[PDB]
């Protein structure tokens, strides 16, 4: 059945009858199949493989007035709008997960009957509890349980018992004290059952209300007397809390006894064929056959049998409302994290009270794209306020902070849209708490963004992910003329996927990030065929290396001009990492006064304040950790050499001698210069060819080595599966900087340095080593020299250099100080 655009508007007004919940399911635990058994059933319509993307599918529910007679939360009426969001399966797609929770309060948790709660289900579970979201479970595939394993009555109940047990555990460890009772129990009718595939589902609560009749037993007592030690005596008719009686004979657990008993009898009489029990048990359960449904046999017959006994939506749509949150009570304890700034502000207080006409606070959680010629939409949650087709909005960029301008475009919305999973529909307005969309913001905002109207109101929370873009790859065009298409297409990609990320490299390569390899490829396919639309190329992301020495040159450097008139004498000595660090941190500035700078570089970093107040230049880029210290007091015309000197220096610091790569922590000490008198033999053309060759020779004597980047990964893994990770760092040199965490949460966070050339596919191995249980936070840490000679094609560093040359098509060997020395 359908509802007109204006009924949606009128229905959305009552935030008490606004159900905003998503999906907490493991890769293939049957969420899509089940969620779409609800569309085919009670799915709202507009007035008249792999889940690559998703949206919030909406459904209607006209509940029982006395069922809402026990709903604890502000709830007015029986006209409920169910704004259901479909969170992706598989891991990596934890970007859509984190973002689908930011635009909801409650969520529907799906679990497999026999595959219980695999790592992905507790991944989604820990993510829901870190968003303060309250959940509701549903054990699906009960058909593959009493068929693919033919499981028995008592055994099946226990199977579910354990499913419950394991979930409550992760729920209580990462639960909220500010919420109270969150772990849903089948004892409180907050965990249904069924088969989205077979088209059925049911709660204990459905039969508690259908058996209060034949017993005079209230529904609160019916379902209480169905879980645990709750038994019955079919010999005297006295429900006893003990499996046996006076004869010591075992009884059936109320649940396995009355409720589940029909089910097995149906299967065997239906599948195995027993027409003498099909029509018989038909009426005993009050099931009615009509037309062609009557003639059906086998597995076809059984599917339709439940479509008359416990149809899907029935107990499913029931619980969604019954116990799950609506903007109302939801935002009323969440508001704190939902707004990152004044939790006592007037805008944050309107959200926590939930005012539909208060200050407009709508956050686009994802720029939902479409075959709208490269243009998207602004899908997000309206915490408070009404979306007016042309309303002026404060596009507060996450960088931006109330007292600034930094990315803030206060413009108005062209058209507005109502979300229907894959259906694009143009609405008028939209009240607070409901999740809607708005076209036009796209050409102003970047990927995600907070929207306000009040300047006092700060920014809201921009996820947290924990997933983070770890993977990396280079993307070069397979045709240099269509490179312009790539630049633009790469921009669109960022906006599309929540945790996807494009960025330029130090090697020129356009490095692309993602979560997993599965993830990355899905992104690349949407990139080469759509976003850009030109044959690409994915190569390993080439690392940057800072050629460096480890001691002062074995002898003084001697380089003379090509006309021969002047020579330069000195020696290069590696600076403390923390001293070259001060250069790149903006403490030892290249724009400072040689005295002020030298006092803080000598008193703080222990140097000779003479050559420290004589620190000539920084390099390269003028801000580089390679400096030239002055120690020449005899050179008359030094002034006609300082300028031409930094010229040939800025050239070697930005292109070394080992294979033409930059350096780091190289303080070249100038001890002499055989100067002339006329700058005609002391011009750039004489001093530059000397200064360059001088630096080189001196370097190959100063004990070469090569510097490669070093990471800092913080893998969030459960203390029990921690063994495997320790060993993947053990295979790719992983010094564990530390290992902190929390007393009550097993999730042991682990810091550990990881060298860039040993993280090329690391995520996959880390994932295969401990299952996807571990979540790595790879954020490049510091620079660290290796331990092999650059002129050694057998040692670590040496092999690198040789491979690096053939790539740029350079001179094979590692040219030394003899090839850069000018002797008599």
């Amino acid at each position: 059945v359908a509802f007109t655009v204006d009924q949606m508007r009128s229905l959305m007004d009552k935030v008490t009858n606004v159900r905003n919940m998503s999906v907490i399911a493991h890769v293939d635990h049957g969420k899509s199949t089940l969620t779409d058994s609800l569309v085919q059933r009670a799915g709202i319509i507009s007035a008249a493989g792999i889940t690559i993307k998703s949206t919030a599918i909406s459904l209607y529910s006209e509940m029982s007035d006395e069922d809402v007679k026990e709903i604890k939360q502000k709830t007015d009426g029986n006209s409920f709008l169910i704004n259901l969001i479909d969170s992706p399966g598989h891991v990596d797609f934890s970007s859509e997960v984190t973002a689908a929770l930011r635009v909801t309060d409650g969520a529907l948790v799906v679990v497999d009957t026999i595959e219980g709660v695999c790592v992905q289900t507790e991944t989604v579970l820990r993510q829901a509890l870190g968003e303060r979201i309250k959940p509701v479970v549903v054990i699906n595939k009960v058909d593959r349980a009493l068929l693919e394993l033919q499981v028995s009555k008592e055994d099946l109940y226990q199977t579910f018992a354990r499913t419950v047990e394991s979930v409550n555990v992760i729920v209580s460890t990462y639960a909220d004290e500010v919420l109270g009772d969150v772990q849903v129990y089948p004892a409180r009718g907050t965990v249904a059952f069924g088969s989205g595939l077979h088209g059925w589902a049911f709660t204990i609560r459905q039969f508690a209300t259908r058996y209060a009749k034949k017993f005079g037993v209230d529904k609160a007592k019916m379902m209480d007397r169905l879980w645990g030690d709750s038994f019955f005596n079919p010999k005297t008719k006295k429900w006893t809390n003990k499996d046996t009686d006076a004869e010591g004979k075992p009884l059936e657990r109320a649940f396995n006894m009355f409720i589940l008993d029909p089910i097995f009898r149906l299967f065997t009489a239906i599948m195995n064929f027993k027409k003498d029990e099909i029509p018989v048990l038909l009426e005993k359960l009050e099931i009615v056959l009509k037309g062609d449904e009557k003639d059906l046999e086998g597995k076809a017959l059984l599917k339709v049998v439940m479509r008359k006994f416990l149809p899907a939506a029935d107990a499913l749509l029931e619980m969604i409302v019954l116990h799950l949150p609506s903007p109302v009570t939801a935002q009323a304890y969440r508001a704190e994290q939902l707004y990152e700034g004044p939790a006592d502000d007037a805008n944050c207080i309107a959200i926590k009270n939930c005012d539909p006409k208060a200050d407009l606070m709508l956050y686009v959680s994802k720029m939902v794209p479409t075959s709208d010629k490269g243009r998207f939409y602004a899908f997000g949650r309206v915490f408070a306020g009404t979306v007016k087709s042309g309303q002026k909005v404060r596009i507060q960029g996450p960088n931006y902070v109330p007292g600034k301008k930094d990315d803030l475009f206060i413009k108005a919305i062209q058209r507005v849209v109502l979300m229907m999973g894959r259906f694009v529909e143009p609405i008028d307005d939209c009240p607070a708490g409901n999740i809607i969309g708005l076209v036009g913001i796209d050409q102003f905002l970047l990927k995600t963004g907070t929207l306000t109207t009040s300047e006092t109101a700060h920014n809201m929370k921009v996820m947290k992910f924990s997933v983070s873009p770890v993977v990396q790859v280079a993307v070069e065009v397979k045709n240099a003329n269509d490179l312009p298409k790539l630049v633009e297409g790469l921009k669109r990609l960022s906006k599309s996927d929540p945790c996807v990320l494009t960025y330029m490299s130090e090697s020129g390569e356009h490095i692309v990030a993602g979560t997993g390899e599965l993830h990355l490829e899905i992104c690349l396919q949407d990139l080469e065929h759509d976003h850009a639309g030109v044959p690409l190329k994915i190569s390993p992301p080439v690392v940057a290396y800072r050629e460096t020495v480890e001691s002062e040159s074995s002898q003084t450097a001697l380089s003379k001009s090509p006309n021969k008139h002047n020579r330069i004498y000195l020696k290069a000595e590696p600076i403390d990492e923390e001293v070259s660090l001060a250069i790149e941190n903006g403490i030892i500035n290249p724009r400072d006064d040689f005295k002020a700078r030298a006092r803080i570089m000598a008193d703080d970093y222990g140097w000779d304040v003479t050559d420290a107040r004589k620190i000539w230049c920084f390099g390269p880029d003028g801000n580089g950790p390679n400096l030239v210290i002055d120690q020449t007091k005899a050179v008359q015309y030094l002034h006609e050499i300082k300028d031409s000197v930094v010229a040939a220096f800025q050239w070697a610091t930005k292109e070394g001698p080992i294979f033409g790569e930059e350096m780091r922590s190289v303080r070249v000490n100038i001890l002499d210069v055989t100067l002339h008198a006329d700058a005609i033999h002391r011009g750039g053309g004489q001093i530059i060819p000397t200064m360059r060759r001088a630096t080189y020779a001196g370097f190959l004597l100063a004990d070469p080595k090569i510097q490669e980047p070093v990471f800092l990964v913080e893998i969030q893994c459960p203390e029990q599966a921690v063994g495997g990770i320790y060993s993947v760092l053990n295979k790719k040199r992983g010094q564990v900087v530390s290992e902190e965490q929390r007393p009550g949460t097993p999730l042991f966070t682990v810091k550990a340095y990881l060298p860039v050339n040993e993280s090329f596919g690391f995520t996959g191995e880390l994932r295969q080593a401990t299952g996807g249980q571990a979540f790595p936070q790879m954020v490049f840490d510091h620079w660290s020299t290796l331990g092999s000679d650059p002129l050694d094609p057998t040692s670590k560093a040496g092999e690198i250099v040789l491979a690096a040359r053939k790539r740029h098509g350079m001179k094979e060997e590692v040219p030394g100080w003899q090839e850069y020395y000018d002797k008599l």
């Binding site: 047990e165 394991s166 729920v171 209580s172 030690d229 009550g744």
Partner: protein
């Protein structure tokens, strides 16, 4: 043959002077508790262990330090041993039949009685709760800690225990080989 021959001279020495002794059996011991009972009496009662070492003592009954070994020799069987004292029995006897109490379950060892357990939370956080899962024991969350749902009879009387079931039992503190080193034979002067 080194130790047995030199031990012959030692064994004979304490037996040659004293006129009070106790025949005590075990096997279900523990070096810790065993050597720690020698500490309760490191001057009142000395513990000496043996075997065929008292079988040469059948040939020792022959020697005749005092022919009254016609009331001691024939009780050679079990992980039994020496209890040297020259103070009154009744007094050291209250003592001896009191230092025997501690052994839990070697996960698979010989089980004896019906295991009836009460259903209340033991105050330990959810660490081994995955055990309870594929073990069949209804559990819930009562103030973060794991709460037992039934006075269930987990393990039966007289069977070969399993590592997973005696692990939870180890955190429930059930150690049933409890007893061990007490008495068998008594004799004075």
């Amino acid at each position: 043959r080194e130790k047995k021959a030199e031990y012959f001279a030692k064994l004979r020495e304490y037996l040659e002077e004293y006129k009070s002794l106790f025949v005590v059996g075990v096997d279900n011991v523990s070096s810790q508790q065993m050597h720690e009972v020698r500490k309760e009496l490191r001057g009142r009662a000395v513990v000496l262990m043996g075997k065929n070492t008292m079988v040469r003592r059948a040939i020792r009954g022959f020697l005749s330090d005092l022919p009254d070994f016609e009331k001691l020799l024939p009780f050679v069987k079990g992980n039994v041993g020496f209890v040297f004292t020259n103070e009154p029995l009744t007094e050291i006897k209250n003592v001896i039949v009191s230092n025997r109490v501690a052994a839990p379950a070697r996960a698979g060892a010989v089980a004896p009685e019906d295991i009836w357990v009460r259903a209340v939370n033991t105050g330990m956080e959810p660490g081994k709760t995955s055990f309870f899962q594929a073990l069949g024991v209804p559990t819930k969350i009562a103030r973060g800690t794991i709460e037992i749902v039934s006075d269930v009879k987990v393990v039966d009387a007289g069977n070969k225990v399993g590592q997973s079931e005696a692990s939870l039992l180890n955190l429930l503190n059930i150690s049933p080989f409890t007893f061990g080193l007490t008495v068998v034979q008594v004799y004075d002067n």
